[PDB]
Amino acid sequence: MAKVQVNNVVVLDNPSPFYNPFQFEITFECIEDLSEDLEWKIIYVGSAESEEYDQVLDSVLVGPVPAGRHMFVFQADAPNPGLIPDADAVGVTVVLITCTYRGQEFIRVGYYVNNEYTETELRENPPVKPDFSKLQRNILASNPRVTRFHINWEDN
């Protein structure tokens, strides 16, 4: 009987360079009133080898949430290319959008992001040193993979 439920998520700038900030549209329906401020986070998995390279893009504190269907925007700065390793820069990765309440997480709407090279010469000849300025990020918005957990939505 979670007070907050989530519904369709629409990523707007799905076609963009590697430096364009993220932009998500989440339609979360809250049933009754909350007592604190919802905390949203974006975690970009810099490398598939391990979490060591995870980047916390930006954490927002949004809680004007009377019952009803609500909206906001979650623009966050692009990941710093320096930390992402070389091999995983050119491959396909995932970006996780998480939400927490009272420091407890309850939804992880994810997204499979891909990183190609736009110019044909680059795909034909992948440079040894990735050049992020000419890298293209496509987020597969058609196949979101959400996972939901049960938490205690108590008063205190």
């Binding site: 439920q5 989530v6 519904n7 369709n8 998520v9 989440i26 339609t27 998995v45 598939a48 080898e49 391990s50 979490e51 060591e52 390279y53 995870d54 980047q55 916390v56 930390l83 995983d88 491959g91 396909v92 990765t93 995932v94 996780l96 998480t98 927490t100 420091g103 407890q104 997480e105 992880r108 709407v109 994810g110 499979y112 979101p144 993979r145 959400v146 996972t147 957990f149 049960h150």
Partner: protein, 534 residues
């Protein structure tokens, strides 16, 4: 209580003496007169020294760990104040952990990692943690003693431990050991259905069931998909139609078969995609090395199904089938390898048998979980123990109906036959779904007492030439500590007054599948690294 802590801090009584006193060890001839007399006098205060000690460290850690331009001052062991007290407290803590006095070993290890991984302070009298230097030194001193547990963790977590700067700063020898670790670790029919109308109706209901499951598979990850609104009407109509023509037995057999079949389940691009897909279904991530019971992935569906069914008939038939299957599986021979010769030509055989066991065990866990979910479903609720008195009526009422599965007898037979590795894990899975009034009945009280005795008998330092392999000990200790740290189980319960087990059957993959919270340690390190860059 505080007096005993101060006395220990002053070194009047050795740490070994007090730890032995807490462990109820026999008084040997070497016991010192003064220390023995003092400990005997304070015996009245025993049974609460250790929880208070844990609370004291938790409280003093609050200043170093958040909640429970700025530069990052690197931690160095030179600028350490009251080094003697920190060293003594760390030694006592290590002795306590190594004797299994604490409920959950990995909870304590997680706390140690948190102390070792403290960023900055947040704004007997003198606190024991004046700066990150003190907490880091304490954490490294405690971790130094515990090497086997760390050595047997994942390869990745070993690597993150290996590259940690603070460990190198405070204990180069430990780093050389865990480096060697990462190194080696990387070097590796028409008769069944009465009449014919019933057979036809079962065919339709099976078709409807597979249809709803396919709908779930297609739609159980899209945002907004609620199981109730989606499938409750269809599941309830199916339950009614199946109860009509008394065909619940066949449908429950199909249900259990599918449950076991499903839940138990460029090339480089595919492998990396698999790792990402594992990332998608990663645990709750919020924290806690002792998370509450949950149904990850396909299992979730079935739980929802049972909840939506809300059928007495189906629930009873499922309980019967699950009990039968669990008893059948627990009795499997599972002939393990005979450690003869060092020939490698028999390689495959080992894995064969091992895999078999793993499969069996996992299945058992799953089934047990669902059994414990449905057996105690009518009783579970947000109703903690009513009160100290006036509950004899409730205990009398609830102590009559026999348990759905004779778990006490199965546990006793398994322990006697030395099959703990196979009998305990699924029992823990079953019990994790109890209510707030189960840890009080004589039956389940005896069950918990037996589990406590077994846990106290599992110390990760001894060896008697073939008692129990280390990884088996780790698996059992982790599961038991997790069991003893669920809100339903009272906190005071722990503080109250040949063969499959001998052969190696649990490996790292099985350990991490059975206990998907060891990775928490790894997570912490990763977090630090990330926060080091940020």
């Amino acid at each position: 209580m505080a007096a005993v802590l101060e006395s220990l801090l002053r070194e009047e009584v050795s740490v070994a003496a007090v730890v032995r006193w807490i462990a109820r060890s026999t008084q040997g001839s070497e016991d010192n007169a003064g220390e023995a007399a003092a400990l005997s006098s304070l015996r009245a205060l025993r049974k609460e020294f250790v929880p208070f000690l844990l609370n004291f460290l938790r409280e003093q850690s609050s200043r170093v760990l958040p909640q429970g331009s700025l530069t990052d001052e690197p931690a160095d062991p030179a600028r350490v104040s009251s080094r003697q007290r920190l060293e003594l407290v760390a030694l006592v803590y290590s002795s306590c952990i190594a004797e299994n006095l604490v409920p959950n070993l990995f909870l304590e290890l997680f706390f140690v990692f948190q102390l070792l991984t403290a960023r900055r302070m947040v704004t007997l009298e003198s606190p024991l943690f004046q700066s990150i230097h003190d907490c880091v030194f304490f954490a490294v001193q405690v971790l130094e003693c515990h090497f086997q547990v760390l050595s047997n963790l994942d390869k990745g977590t070993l690597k993150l431990l290996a590259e940690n700067e603070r460990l190198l700063c405070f204990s180069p020898a430990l780093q050389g050991r865990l480096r060697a670790a990462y190194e080696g670790s990387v070097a590796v029919n028409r008769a069944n259905f009465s009449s014919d109308r019933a057979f036809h109706t079962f065919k339709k209901q099976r078709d409807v069931f597979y249809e709803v499951l396919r709908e779930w598979e297609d739609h159980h990850e899209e945002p907004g998909w609620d199981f109730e609104k989606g499938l409750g009407s269809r599941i309830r109509a199916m339950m009614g139609q199946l109860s009509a023509a008394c065909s619940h037995s066949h449908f429950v057999r199909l249900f259990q078969k599918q449950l076991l079949q499903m839940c138990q389940s460029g090339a480089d691009k595919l492998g990396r995609l698999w790792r990402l897909q594992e990332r998608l279904m990663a645990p709750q991530s919020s924290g806690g090395p002792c998370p509450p019971p949950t149904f990850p992935g396909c299992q979730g569906f079935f739980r929802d199904f049972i909840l939506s069914a809300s059928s007495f008939q189906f629930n009873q038939h499922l309980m019967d089938s699950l009990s039968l299957k669990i008893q059948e599986l627990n009795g499997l021979a599972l002939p393990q390898h005979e450690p003869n010769d060092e020939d490698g030509e028999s390689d495959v055989d080992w894995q064969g048998e091992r895999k078999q066991f793993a499969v069996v065990l996992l299945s058992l866990r799953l089934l047990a979980k669902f059994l414990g979910f449905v057996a105690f479903l009518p009783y579970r609720g947000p109703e903690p123990p009513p009160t100290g008195e006036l509950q004899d009526s409730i205990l009398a009422l609830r102590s009559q109906v026999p348990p759905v599965l004779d778990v006490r007898t199965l546990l006793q037979r398994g322990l006697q036959a030395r099959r703990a590795v196979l009998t305990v894990p699924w029992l823990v899975e079953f019990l994790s779904f109890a209510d707030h009034v189960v840890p009080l009945l004589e039956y389940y009280r005896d069950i918990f007492t037996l589990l406590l005795r077994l846990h106290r008998s599992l110390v990760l330092s001894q060896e008697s030439e073939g008692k129990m392999c280390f990884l088996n000990k780790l698996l059992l200790l982790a599961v038991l500590g997790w069991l003893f740290q669920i809100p339903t189980v009272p906190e005071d319960l722990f503080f109250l007054e040949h063969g499959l087990d001998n052969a190696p059957v649990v490996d790292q993959q099985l350990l991490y599948t059975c206990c998907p919270y060891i990775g928490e340690l790894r997570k912490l390190l990763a977090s630090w690294v990330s926060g080091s860059s940020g």
